[PDB]
A paper describes a structure:
The crystal structure of S. cerevisiae Tim50(164–361) determined in this study is named Tim50_new and the crystal structure of Tim50(164–361) described previously is termed Tim50_old. The structure of Tim50_new was determined to 2.67 Å resolution by the molecular-replacement method using Tim50_old as the search model. Six monomers are present in one asymmetric unit of Tim50_new, while only one monomer is present in the asymmetric unit of Tim50_old. Compared with the previously determined Tim50(164–361) structure, significant conformational changes occur within the protruding β-hairpin of Tim50 and the nearby helix A2. Surprisingly, for members of both group I and group II the putative presequence-binding grooves are occupied by secondary structures from the neighboring monomers. Tyr223 from helix A1 of the neighbouring molecule makes extensive hydrophobic interactions with Trp207 and Trp213 from the protruding β-hairpin. Therefore, it is likely that Tim50_old represents the presequence-free conformation of the IMS domain of Tim50 and the Tim50_new corresponds to the presequence-binding conformation of the IMS domain of Tim50.
The IMS domain of Tim50 interacts with the N-terminal IMS domain of Tim23 to deliver the preproteins to Tim23. Tim50 also functions as a hub protein to interact with other TIM23 complex members such as Tim21 to regulate the opening and closure of the Tim23 transmembrane channel. The crystal structure of Tim50(164–361) contains a large groove as a putative binding site for the presequences and a protruding β-hairpin.
Author numbering: 171 to 357
The structure:
């Protein structure tokens, strides 16, 4: 284990040519997986349609940080079905790494030791990015039904990485509602 200082959560990015143009921070529950209890089956957990492709494909443009909103043991339990694909994640973070202020657990992007102009967070609770909403792409919580909402995020995210932009924050502010970002991306 080689890791961060003072008291930044991530070690420094590798130098070019290995550095990715951008850092993508994503949450775990109600985004990649969904867990539920029924009488017929146990506690079962499901992986979203396209999760494997999503992580594998975007890893070529992004340093992918899986920042769970859950404590680590619970996170590990419901993330089990992500095992064969999990190696494409660069770093793992958990609720233990959030900051507590105003009765809210916040993923404070400034503690990531990353240039904030080069960082995107996708999450299902706006409080998780309460300190840096200008970096955020909101998603409504996944309830377990098959969809392709995940994969449809890719063309815009792929666009950002292959377009030399020196800041990602003014571009997200150029949408007048980020909840329809994927299709608003259609001219
Ligand atoms: Mg799948």
């Amino acid at each position: 284990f080689q890791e961060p200082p003072f008291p930044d959560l991530l070690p420094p990015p590798p130098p070019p040519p290995y550095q990715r143009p951008l850092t993508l921070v994503i949450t775990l529950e109600d985004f990649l997986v969904h867990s539920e209890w029924s009488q017929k089956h146990g506690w079962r957990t499901a992986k979203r349609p396209g999760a494997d492709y999503f992580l594998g494909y975007l890893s070529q443009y992004y340093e992918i940080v899986l920042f769970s909103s859950n404590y680590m043991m619970y996170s590990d339990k419901i993330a089990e079905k992500l095992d064969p694909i999990h190696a494409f994640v660069s770093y793992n973070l958990f609720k233990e790494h959030c900051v507590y202020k105003d009765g809210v657990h916040i993923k404070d992007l400034s503690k990531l030791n990353r240039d904030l102009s080069k960082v995107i967070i996708i999450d299902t609770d706006p409080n998780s990015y309460k300190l840096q909403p200008e970096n955020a792409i909101p998603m409504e919580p996944w309830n377990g039904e098959a969809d392709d909402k995940l994969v449809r995020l890719i063309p815009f995210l792929e666009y950002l990485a292959t377009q030399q932009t020196k800041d990602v924050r003014p571009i997200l502010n150029s949408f007048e509602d980020k909840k329809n970002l994927a299709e608003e991306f259609d001219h």
